[PDB]
Design a protein around this ligand. Structure first.
Ligand SMILES: *[C@@H]1O[C@H](CO)[C@@H](O)[C@H](O)[C@H]1NC(C)=O
Ligand SMILES: *[C@@H]1O[C@H](CO)[C@@H](O)[C@H](O)[C@H]1NC(C)=O
Ligand SMILES: *[C@@H]1O[C@H](CO)[C@@H](O)[C@H](O)[C@H]1NC(C)=O
Ligand SMILES: *[C@@H]1O[C@H](CO)[C@@H](O)[C@H](O)[C@H]1NC(C)=O
Lengths: 351, 351
């Protein structure tokens, strides 16, 4: 046969240091379709971390690994309490991935929803580490509770009979190693307050040490703080970035502790933008196109979400919260304009 | 089923007024693969034109028409006579299309090689106009001779038994009508000499009438004269262009009267560049990258031709003629710099 390109090669070749994904729907739909239908050849789970998940190896000329995040809540679950509470939301990863493309960031790895038949697809290729955590619930649904720091028998992820809904997230290829640093605006995760909550010229302190003095890092974190605020992710306490000879970029990896509460907008997430009053020019241009379109951000987002196999992805309240929070980002940007003047707020760094 | 895009929609959506094709191999291979395998639902031929060809309707949700150019020569045929002598070369269309992408022009419609079973695929859907020109040759191969101006029974295109090799070229969609004008540097097609062969300030005369006074038309013809010079196409006496509200572009349509002789370089093809000494900046930049790559233009071109079903497409002598002619282009440009200074020859028109 002729003119064949395999989806896993499409994924490996589309990454550059300033873009994980591309505008082409043909290329992305090609990758999502393969993630959606590829045979699972191995399945396991790990001891590190606090969240229950699995790792699937998908078939192909070369094997492609994905993270599998199971459904843990109904679509109408409300996550209150602490801004960080609870299990990762599989539908939030899907929504965040498409919103990252819609806003032109292109910094999130592909995510697809999928209904996994645990009996037919997982058990016949499961590692012992995963298989030994399968149990049944009170209604004889098939479940597993995994291994991880907080994983235990009383908190399983349960299928509906044997069919488990979840999200698949592509591994980045080995050519693109990921580095992790603490976020200057991370929270304390106790009762004390962080420095940025008490200090208000805190950005002046950040820009003094590297890597925030020169280069794209601080504008990336401001981009990502806008993205995290719109989805309600208050828990990027450590950020991750790729890097080569041509630069670096903070990536939107693991966005699942989001879309937990459609009734509150956590403006503290916007602290990098509000305190620094710097904004990358290309980001600003796309934000004003988004507010001046005749279709709101959420109308455009749900059109993209309607292609995913497990759609509906978000309830209408989260969609309207997006549009409300986009206006709040515009307001924060304008306040930076008032108090430092536009031509000192908008930075054209050609990214 | 999920994430489906049909190839004919990929073709219709990728065209803009300054690019018929795109850099994405995924999108282009998707279209080429469909051309390679699509069922032929209709076949005909016309009275207009000078060259024997057919028109095929390919199946799909919508019908997609292609021009079919049959093989007429061996790969190693040396075509002597006038610079424009002979039949259309089917393999030249394939090579010219991939070179158009390799050089970054993106002005050529997709072309694929294909082996056509005339008995099974063409005859049962052939219109009478085409069917009545089918004959057998002295070795009982199935052939057809068409109804064009020079088409006649003594000059048929013949298959091997019933399998006919040829090239398929996509029609532009109806949304992109093509307009034709005489080329200011066209030949006389007699033994008289054309005005540009006698005068040496001829370009000065061209730029005074429209559409050569302003806009992209003249730099397009200089681009296309470089492209035609590399492939040996001395027969673009009329050029064709697309146009809408955002501009216009001369397209590389019908490139088959090329690669006729790998040992002769007809420098008269470069007359628009040599006489005008203007060169679009982006074209110059890509030409300089092509000469400084560690892999020659012909090595990179043959790697792309190796995916086509009827490969080998060009003999190594035509591949090396490409590299030879690229240096001759550089010489002509450097001569323009010496006699008008570089910054009056390189025009940055942002195209
Ligand atoms: C679901 O459970 C029923 C029994 O209620 C069984 O008949 C059926 O085969 C199960 N379906 C799957 C996909 O396991
Ligand atoms: C960095 O950019 C240059 C220029 O586009 C490119 O040639 C090079 O391959 C890039 N770096 C890597 C590691 O690919
Ligand atoms: C193909 O053509 C040859 C003539 O060269 C003929 O003898 C033969 O029977 C044909 N065979 C098939 C399988 O079409
Ligand atoms: C380019 O022209 C097309 C119509 O030919 C139009 O739809 C489009 O809006 C134009 N581009 C821009 C950026 O306005």
């Amino acid at each position: 046969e002729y003119f064949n390109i395999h989806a896993w090669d499409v994924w490996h070749d589309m990454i550059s240091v300033r873009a994980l994904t591309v505008d082409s729907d043909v290329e992305i739909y090609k990758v999502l379709k393969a993630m959606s239908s590829a045979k699972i050849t191995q399945a396991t789970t790990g001891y590190k971390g606090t969240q229950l998940k699995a790792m699937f190896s998908l078939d192909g000329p070369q094997i492609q690994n994905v993270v599998f995040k199971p459904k843990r809540y109904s679509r109408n679950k409300i996550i209150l309490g602490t801004p960080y509470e609870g299990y990762d939301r599989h539908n939030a990863e899907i929504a965040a991935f498409h919103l990252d493309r819609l806003l032109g960031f292109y910094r999130a790895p592909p995510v697809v929803g999928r209904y996994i038949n645990l009996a037919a697809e997982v058990l016949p290729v499961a590692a012992k580490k995963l298989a030994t955590t399968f149990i049944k619930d009170k209604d004889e649904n098939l479940c597993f509770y995994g291994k991880c720091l907080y994983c235990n028998r009383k908190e399983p992820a349960c299928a509906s009979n044997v069919t488990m809904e979840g999200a698949l997230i592509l591994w980045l290829p080995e050519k693109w190693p990921v580095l992790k640093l603490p976020h200057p605006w991370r929270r304390t995760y106790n009762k004390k307050m962080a420095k940025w909550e008490t200090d208000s010229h805190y950005c002046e302190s950040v820009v003094i040490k590297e890597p925030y003095t020169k280069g794209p890092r601080l504008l990336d974190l401001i981009d990502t703080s806008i993205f995290d605020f719109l989805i309600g992710n208050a828990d990027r306490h450590h950020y991750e970035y790729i890097e080569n000879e041509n630069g670096s970029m903070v990536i939107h990896l693991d966005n699942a502790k989001s879309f937990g509460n459609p009734f509150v907008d956590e403006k503290s997430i916007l602290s990098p933008l509000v305190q620094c009053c710097r904004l990358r020019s290309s980001t600003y241009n796309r934000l004003k196109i988004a507010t001046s379109n005749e279709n709101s951000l959420s109308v455009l987002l749900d059109k993209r979400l309607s292609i995913d196999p497990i759609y509906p992805i978000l309830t209408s309240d989260h969609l309207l919260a997006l549009d409300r929070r986009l206006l709040l980002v515009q307001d924060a940007v304008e306040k930076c304009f008032k108090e430092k003047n536009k031509e000192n707020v908008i930075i054209e760094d050609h990214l």
